[PDB]
Amino acid sequence: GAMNSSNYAELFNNDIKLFVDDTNVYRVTVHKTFEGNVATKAINGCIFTLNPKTGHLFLKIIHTSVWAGQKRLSQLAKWKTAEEVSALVRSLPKEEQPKQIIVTRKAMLDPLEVHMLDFPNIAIRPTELRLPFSAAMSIDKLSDVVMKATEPQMVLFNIYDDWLDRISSYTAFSRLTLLLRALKTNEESAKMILLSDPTITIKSYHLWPSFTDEQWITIESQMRDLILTEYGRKYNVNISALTQTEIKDIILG
């Protein structure tokens, strides 16, 4: 059934699985018209399709032309997501096809199930996890390929860079979700923490900076502080009064 805190290790077993996040598929700016009405202008979006074990990211760029002359775009966006995920699965060799697809939003279940009727042995699952994949567009290189696209395009990334050389998938996923949670909570502060020290660069072929194991510990701490610092300024809570057990809970929560 549902993917939760209870069955978290399942993400890192040897059954191929993908997360699908549709949060960034349909993106608009809301603006005033000359007559003082409100209108939307779409901008390029993306489907975020991630193998949590390998870090392989299938970033399908959704060009604004997709929306031209269509109605009920927020509804269409779910069906277009499901169409593109099913096209991706059909494009993969059988031994690379996932055994499960976990959707980050329950509204993706029916659209994906209907598009995958041809794949009765692929399980379509919701999750109880509140994953911060909406913040993918706060990763500069992913934002840049989406906003430059002039046509529908698929771009392949490894969202873990070379981390799996040194850490397990479990730890890599934890690092990714902490970085994305921080970027989602306070983008400016998170980017400052990641890019303040100019001696640590991002390799041409990477998304994140080239931190040593010790530097990642410091960065991870700075991200956890930011999420509590922000959860403090949000709820008007003296964070310096909090203990380590009640600190632990709020990043999870």
Binding site: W79, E83, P111, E113, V114, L117
Partner: protein
């Protein structure tokens, strides 16, 4: 006017005949039901006083043969049987009528209730949903599962209703996923009407027969089928005007007849709320919406 005689009534039982029912005591001198209107299917049905799990009955049409009821003390139920000897049968019925040992089918002249519930229901179509080819009458009970229920066990004792599945390759054309899921007109008009049922009369028959088996036997799979057949019409943007007008009449009489105290178990909140307030046909079922709002406003 036709007659279904009973050999005897050895056990206390509530006997239903269509929408009517009466209590018979253990060994009460009861010898059957007379003045049964010709032109309609009928259902006799039983609920034993000592065991309400025993809830079962027989669909029949007096035009197709001479039928009687006889209690079987081995299988512990009232069985329908056919008498092939016309003259023996007439001679039996005549004796029981002379001794006035039969209840009269209690139809008010004004009252079209049974016609309105069985307008499209045909014995030939029942005998395809309930498969027992050596009998002209069909046995149904509270426990019998549907072919669709048996897929998600004993196939000879199943209700072969037409399988309806909104998330099935039958329901969804490759390349029309969103269109066919959000607007079921394809599935209704091409697959089900043109393809399987051939016409709206066969579709309405099944729908009516599913409802009656839900109401009279508390058959859960029948209730699922009735609601699926309503939802498939209500969820289609393109339905012939004659079918919508007829559906409104069918559902009105079904909701009219439903015992108030079984509304909670026999009506699906989601389907009715979607059909009356959300669907393409939300404004097409005037009679049904008015009786539902006046009789069952809590469900809505």
């Amino acid at each position: 006017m036709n007659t279904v005689p009973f050999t005897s009534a050895p056990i206390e039982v509530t006997i239903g005949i269509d929408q009517y029912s009466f209590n018979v005591k253990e060994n009460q001198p009861f010898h059957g039901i007379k003045d049964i209107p010709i032109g309609h299917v009928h259902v006799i049905h039983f609920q034993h006083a000592d065991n309400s799990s025993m809830r079962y009955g027989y669909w029949f049409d007096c035009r197709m043969g001479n039928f009687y009821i006889q209690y079987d003390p081995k299988d512990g139920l009232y069985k329908m049987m056919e008498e092939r000897d016309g003259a023996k049968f007439e001679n039996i019925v005549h004796n029981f009528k002379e001794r006035q040992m039969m209840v009269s089918y209690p139809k008010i002249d004004e009252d079209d209730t049974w016609y309105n519930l069985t307008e499209f229901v045909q014995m030939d179509k029942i005998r395809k949903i309930v498969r027992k080819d050596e009998n002209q009458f069909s046995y149904v009970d509270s426990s019998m599962t549907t072919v669709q229920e048996n897929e998600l066990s004993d196939p000879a004792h199943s209700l072969n209703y037409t399988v309806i599945n909104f998330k099935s390759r039958e329901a969804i054309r490759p390349g029309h996923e969103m269109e066919d899921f959000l607007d079921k007109s394809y599935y209704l008009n091409t697959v089900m009407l043109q393809g399987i049922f051939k016409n709206s009369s066969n579709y309405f028959g099944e729908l009516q027969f599913a409802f009656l088996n839900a109401m009279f036997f508390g058959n859960y799979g029948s209730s699922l089928q009735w609601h699926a057949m309503i939802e498939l019409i209500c969820s289609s943007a393109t339905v012939p005007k004659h079918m919508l007008d007829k559906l409104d009449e069918i559902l009105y009489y079904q909701i009219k007849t439903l015992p108030e105290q079984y509304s909670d178990i026999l009506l699906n909140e989601r389907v009715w709320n979607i059909c009356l307030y959300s669907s393409f046909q939300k404004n097409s079922l005037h009679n049904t919406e008015k009786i539902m709002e006046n009789k069952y406003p809590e469900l809505l």
